[PDB]
């Protein structure tokens, strides 16, 4: 392990404190770090992942990134208190803290990401996944990022926490009844409920017939329709410890795409 130029112990505690004041920030921080890495294309070698390039235009205005100004402004206060950390490292660490804080795995944090200087390094639009589409589109996007099906299904499992907002995606509501908790409940929900058409939302989404309080996107239910993805949905619904380990490995790989010679940070 190597000590960073910022006080990581005090920073990790201040992120947990910020999340305790507004628990809905936890999932938002995870989505911020995921979309900062999702611009990547392993075939074209561009997009500038894990460089905090979403702070500038045009990437900040892409449809897929609507609402992500909230976790960005929440973390600007921590950037002032800890000026030695880069914005790119801060977004990744904030996602790792939120995952552990909500009961998920402890992901070992590597530091050293260099921030983007301006919007000229940004990738084009159309890189972020669309909730209205199914397995052909989902596999195309994750293959472009360099993930196999096992890793794709583990990563979409982050929908265990958070919710959809009409103003950001046009969809509405949470995927599970513990929206501020991180575990394999997205997969048990996906298999155990009868997902019926929700007639109260204009953008097509399904609801659980048991309570009508949960939702699934077409991109979520495509994991059951595809023969390969269904087998991983079944694996994770049955084993939470396996889900935590496979999510930790895939989320770490995601947040280290396009990075070079990072440093292992100390634990706790």
């Amino acid at each position: 392990s190597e000590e960073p130029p910022f006080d990581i112990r005090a920073l990790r505690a201040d992120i947990e404190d910020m999340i305790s004041e507004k628990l809905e920030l936890g999932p938002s921080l995870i989505r911020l770090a995921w979309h900062e890495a999702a611009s990547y294309d392993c075939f074209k070698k561009d997009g500038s992942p894990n460089s905090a390039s979403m702070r500038f235009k045009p990437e900040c205005l892409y449809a897929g990134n609507k609402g992500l100004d909230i976790p960005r402004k929440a973390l600007e206060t921590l950037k002032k208190k800890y000026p030695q950390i880069s914005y790119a490292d801060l977004w990744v660490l904030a996602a790792y803290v939120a995952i552990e804080y909500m009961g998920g795995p402890t992901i070992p944090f590597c530091w050293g990401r260099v921030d983007a200087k301006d919007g000229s390094v940004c990738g084009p639009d159309g890189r972020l996944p669309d909730g209205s589409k199914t397995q052909s589109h989902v596999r195309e996007v994750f293959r472009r990022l360099g993930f196999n099906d096992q890793e794709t299904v583990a990563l979409i499992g982050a929908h265990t926490c958070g919710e959809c907002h009409i103003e950001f995606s046009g969809y509405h509501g949470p995927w599970t009844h513990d929206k501020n908790g991180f575990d394999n409940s997205f997969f048990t929900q996906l298999l155990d409920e009868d997902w019926v058409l929700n007639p109260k939302v204009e953008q097509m989404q399904l609801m659980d017939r048991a309570t009508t309080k949960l939702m699934m996107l077409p991109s979520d239910v495509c994991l059951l329709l595809d023969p390969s993805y269904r087998k991983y949905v079944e694996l994770y619904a049955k084993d939470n410890d396996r889900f935590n380990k496979d999510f930790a490995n895939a989320f770490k790989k995601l947040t280290e795409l396009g990075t070079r010679n990072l440093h292992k940070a100390p634990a706790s």
């Binding site: 628990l23 552990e100 991180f182 575990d183 409940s185």
Partner: protein, 102 residues
Amino acid sequence: GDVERGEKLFKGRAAQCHTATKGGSNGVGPNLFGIVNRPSGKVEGFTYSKANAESGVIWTPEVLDVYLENPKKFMPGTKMSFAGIKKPQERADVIAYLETLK
């Protein structure tokens, strides 16, 4: 624990499944009014799992502390889909709020 922080944690972590008012409605989970120091699986009107119904645990503050850290590890077969409260301070706060429900 702190009752104020406990109520806010309960709103943010338990409200989708549990009600806290006296004579409150049963939903995904049972009504938890008066649950501190009660035997498990006895809230009126709720249909428990096989594990929680036949369980021998009593919900004292020390037992609630272990359960809330990892429900499926403490009571295998439970249908409570909760990730758990990993930090002791938050568990203690939530348990202090449950103690005020008569």
